[PDB]
Symmetry: D2
Subunit: 333 residues, 4 copies
Amino acid sequence: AVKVAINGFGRIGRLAFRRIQEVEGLEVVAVNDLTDDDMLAHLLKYDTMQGRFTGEVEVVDGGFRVNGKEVKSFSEPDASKLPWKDLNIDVVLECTGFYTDKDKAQAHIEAGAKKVLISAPATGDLKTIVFNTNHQELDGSETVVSGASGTTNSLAPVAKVLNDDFGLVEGLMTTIHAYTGDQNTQDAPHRKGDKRRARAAAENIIPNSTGAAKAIGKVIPEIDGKLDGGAQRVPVATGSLTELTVVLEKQDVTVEQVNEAMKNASNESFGYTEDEIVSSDVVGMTYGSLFDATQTRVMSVGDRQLVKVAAWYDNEMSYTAQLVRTLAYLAEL
Amino acid sequence: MAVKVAINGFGRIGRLAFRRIQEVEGLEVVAVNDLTDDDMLAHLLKYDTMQGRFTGEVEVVDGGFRVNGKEVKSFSEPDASKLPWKDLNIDVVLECTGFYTDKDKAQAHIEAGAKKVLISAPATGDLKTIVFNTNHQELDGSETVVSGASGTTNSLAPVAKVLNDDFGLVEGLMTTIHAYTGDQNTQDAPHRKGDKRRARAAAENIIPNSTGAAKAIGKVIPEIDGKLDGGAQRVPVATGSLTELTVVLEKQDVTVEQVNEAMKNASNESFGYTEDEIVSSDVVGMTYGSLFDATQTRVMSVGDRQLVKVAAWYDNEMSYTAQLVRTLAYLAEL
Amino acid sequence: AVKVAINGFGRIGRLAFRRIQEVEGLEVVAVNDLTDDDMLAHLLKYDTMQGRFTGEVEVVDGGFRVNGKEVKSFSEPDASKLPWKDLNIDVVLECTGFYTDKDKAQAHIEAGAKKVLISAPATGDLKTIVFNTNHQELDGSETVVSGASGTTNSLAPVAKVLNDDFGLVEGLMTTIHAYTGDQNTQDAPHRKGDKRRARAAAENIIPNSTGAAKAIGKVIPEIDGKLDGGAQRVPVATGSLTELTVVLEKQDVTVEQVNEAMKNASNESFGYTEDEIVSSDVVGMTYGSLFDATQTRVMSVGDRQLVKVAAWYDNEMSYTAQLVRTLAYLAELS
Amino acid sequence: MAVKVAINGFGRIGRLAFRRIQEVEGLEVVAVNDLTDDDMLAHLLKYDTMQGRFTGEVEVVDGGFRVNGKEVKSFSEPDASKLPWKDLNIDVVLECTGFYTDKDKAQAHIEAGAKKVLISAPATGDLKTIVFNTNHQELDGSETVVSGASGTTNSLAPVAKVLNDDFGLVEGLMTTIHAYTGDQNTQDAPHRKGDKRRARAAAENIIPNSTGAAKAIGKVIPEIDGKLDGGAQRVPVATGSLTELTVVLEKQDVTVEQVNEAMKNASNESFGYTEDEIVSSDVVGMTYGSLFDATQTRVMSVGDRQLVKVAAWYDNEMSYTAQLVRTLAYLAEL
Ligand SMILES: NC(=O)c1ccc[n+]([C@@H]2O[C@H](COP(=O)([O-])OP(=O)(O)OC[C@H]3O[C@@H](n4cnc5c(N)ncnc54)[C@H](O)[C@@H]3O)[C@@H](O)[C@H]2O)c1
Ligand SMILES: NC(=O)c1ccc[n+]([C@@H]2O[C@H](COP(=O)([O-])OP(=O)(O)OC[C@H]3O[C@@H](n4cnc5c(N)ncnc54)[C@H](O)[C@@H]3O)[C@@H](O)[C@H]2O)c1
Ligand SMILES: NC(=O)c1ccc[n+]([C@@H]2O[C@H](COP(=O)([O-])OP(=O)(O)OC[C@H]3O[C@@H](n4cnc5c(N)ncnc54)[C@H](O)[C@@H]3O)[C@@H](O)[C@H]2O)c1
Ligand SMILES: NC(=O)c1ccc[n+]([C@@H]2O[C@H](COP(=O)([O-])OP(=O)(O)OC[C@H]3O[C@@H](n4cnc5c(N)ncnc54)[C@H](O)[C@@H]3O)[C@@H](O)[C@H]2O)c1
């Protein structure tokens, strides 16, 4: 089995862990964060939105035991000092939010790990992977890799069908997105100086930025520079929706043509629905993106068309299933 | 004389219209009709989850309730044709029930004795749909039934009118990220209109939904009739909403600054302008019918081809109410 | 298998349906509500707090097919007119909220059902059953029976231990309780005239009544009249917490004594925990009441003690699991 | 002439203290210290999710910010002993960081040059704990570090005092149903104090928690030292809270009206009284330190033995802050 360390046992780290339980050839041997074992153990076991952890968890000496298997824990905020050589780590899942750079992430490798898969977009000379859109670009020699963002994962397979079947001229996106842990509970100073992320997360529609559309060319180079957009953080604790408005090259585009094109591209990563669902219906789903055929619109004025589509994602679990697929694929090369 | 106003449907809109009318000299609410007792009516005027405590004093009396010493008569008659509007001398009925959104239906208030009816919603039939400071000048004061449009329409109109006038609107799509409203369920249950999405827990979901605001925009700005469409996402804020508009324009080298400057130049009491990074709670209770947020303007350019995106905030409650009351005053005054 | 009809395919009826899928012995053959098949099928399948329904649901002619089994559906608001004789109904789960009286429920019997188990407290000459506290009072000759309430099911086994081991003098209760469907999404008239249920459910701590404590004597007659209290509806969509403050006869009571007595009474209905959980952790649980040992307090001033305890319940699934146990038990007698 | 105030920690309480000080003669905020830039400080004064837009005008300038023409200097120094309080002539520091709640730590502001420190929380050490209008008369103005207690203490004290003075308090237990605060997480995450319950999603849970309000009440009302205890349930409102107290009393034939009348007779600027069926959003921004709700009073009687329960609302933000600023004014004036 591939030996995994999880750095940052936060929302993604912990759900990556739950997910790795359902995956042969992957084993989490170690976990690092900034808290005690009791806390780590407790947060794995109970999850507001994702539900009770099905197995058994107990705090032991080196960390905690999950279903008889011992997971070692650490409390070391500087990664370069983790005992990854001593532990024989194949891959570190980098989930802290603080090592989102090819150069910053290289500290795990100095610590003894063989690879680092970052749970976020990341700066620097590395590949950005959405599984089932461009994971074939990995040859397994890579040491640092980005699993992109929940939003990119929602967007990529939608954008790829649109461009392959119709020719993407240009488009704009808004993600209506669950609030995340980088937002305040109450209006308070925000450490990045962001006046909107400063505000009470569960009491507001909050406009915010996201590089998902700007940087999409890292995943689909042929549409590099053709999309942009941002987010509206809103009071659901998880569950998100990506809206994409586009101009296409193809001329007499109908709703049915778009939907059929989308359905034909469905797989484990890209789902397709025609049910009138809402966000809580995607909590815990493992599709990276779920195309909502009910939300497709075609605006036509003479020969000129604007096409709009929308895809659901559990920004938590959807992203986490994608990340773990990329992990397994990366491990296997 | 002050204009004698009846409010039919003392709901979110009715009650906020009432609070609003207290600050608009020249208008007086003499009567209120709903489906409940005075105690309930008085109580909900005084206390408001999102809009705050009512500033004056409210007390339940015989015919209804007393607000700062002025008596408001109240009724509990679901059939409007049977209200005593002649006897009370009603000049204008604010029609805020959600149940008379048709020119012929709201005609029942006129059969009841009122002189005019201003419907607090889009409305079907042969009547004018008015967004104050965009097309209120189409009123000549002979009208007897008028629609004040919707919150979202009021958010959208002055934005669309600037875009078309300064740049030529080719076409556009809209999403409103919208506070939940009383037409949604508290918990997943049957919905009376059979709407499977409004059926779901309002405060626990991002819920897709329809709105005619972009489709019917041609009622307010006829030169762009047919050029916009879009919908809503109802999300868990109890009030406050945001309209996002994505457009194709005829003018060619459009910049963020051109759009923002064009919007700023059209600002007035109905259409506001901000460059502060605000969020939805910051517009709760504001009186602009639409607040253009210059921090959300994007221009997407690929060769000669551009997509332009803008967004305007609105308190679907208070913004809409301020605009409806301005229309009321203007209508009354003719 | 026992042939079950569900009257009222609401939160409780739908979850009862999901639950019945996990019980050999029982089959839902029919469902009655006020809406179309499409709506029913949709709400079974999708659930905001309780998650997707695991099986497959498809709308067919008579109603819907769940995992190949056909469920007939009706849209008949008057129960006496349902085809219960024709369908051979053994037990009606009465989940509408509108038939909470022995004689009202009696309409299902006139319709051809053999028994009626009401999903709520219920007035009249019948038994009120909390499973594993007093379900042994059933001999199976009963035709109408009440499953009591979420809150009563959370309370009874706590109160029974307290009285049996320590002697209950008196006590007061507050249930801190998820908002339910009879509360309003936005501040509006409430049909029962309740000025607190009238307010926006998801934006307030809201005081409300509950008969759970007053009426506990229907479940545990030896403590009849010794308890009282109410609720505070707060903005969680499901999950609730009952706090009980009591005076006991026994004199030198410790936290450990209370906890150990609770632990010793645990079973499939009454759970016990020492983990620092919160309400989202009990969503979907099947204990009717989960005693939280971390919240036990003993206040002592000289010889005089106040003792406080607290038990969690998913007012939806805890209540439903209890209701389904009572149904199974009732069905199995004669 | 005005008393010169510095606000250490410009958070929920620090900012709302600032707004509140605008309405008080002879207090002036000349300085503000936090851990962020001027832009962030200015912005958060101006916009407030639950308390509404700040009425005056706020602009970022060199030393900090201008509020209605008055310059406020700002600093970003996490170690208080290094702030220029001597240079600025600080009379009183409002200690609102949450990080200096001990007399000896707090003494760092005095080392910095301030004359006095009023801490915006319970505080450890040899100092006075003041709830205004309950025990502020224990101040003689020689004190240099003082605690303004907690939101919950301020809600409780005047209720407890009336109970003891008029009836004789034997003992009691409290639960505060309390809005979530900023030491709670947005999403389930490690919590810095190891609190497994404060670690959970604030706005998605009923969350049991501790509070010393009842335990430490003796610091404010010595004659009832040791006679109360209790805790909290943090729930998903953003502000607004409710204290429930269940007591045993020496007086024997106590009625609901007796208790209520006693409470009414003790009302003042700090202690309000209502008989309206309000809810938590009705107390947002109120300036009563506690608002006694006569509608929630219960008396449980079994033979000669009674349990009495009462309930007081408080805006844990503004109610506390109004009380804090009164104590500040009083302290300044001696
Ligand atoms: N919907 C989503 O939450 C989502 C989706 C996709 C990607 N992500 C990304 O995943 C990463 C984690 O986000 P999250 O929501 O799980 O955040 P989180 O706050 O829940 O988890 C971060 C964890 O990192 C720990 N941490 C911080 N600094 C550390 C350090 N130096 N060493 C060890 N641990 C440290 C924290 O204690 C915390 O438990 C972020 O980069 C985020 O962008 C989040
Ligand atoms: N965001 C908004 O709430 C918003 C904004 C703009 C416009 N509107 C429109 O205004 C109308 C009402 O809006 P609301 O949100 O205040 O709804 P609401 O339910 O709160 O108010 C409707 C009121 O009408 C009463 N009522 C219903 N039928 C009646 C009858 N036959 N006779 C007398 N009273 C009756 C109801 O009891 C209720 O008080 C709807 O048309 C709505 O679309 C709503
Ligand atoms: N936490 C809870 O939701 C809770 C807990 C325990 C018990 N209960 C009790 O169970 C009952 C149902 O509560 P719910 O919360 O599931 O309510 P709900 O509104 O979600 O369900 C009631 C359903 O009955 C239908 N209905 C109303 N009248 C009808 C009629 N005459 N014929 C057929 N269908 C009719 C409605 O369409 C609705 O689907 C109530 O008696 C309630 O007190 C609720
Ligand atoms: N309901 C309430 O919010 C409430 C009620 C009563 C008392 N209090 C008390 O008031 C205090 C602050 O509470 P709050 O809710 O306003 O929290 P907050 O987080 O909103 O405010 C604290 C502020 O102090 C700043 N800060 C932190 N450390 C600092 C440092 N060492 N130097 C300078 N600035 C620093 C933070 O950036 C933050 O802006 C706490 O002691 C709390 O218990 C809060």
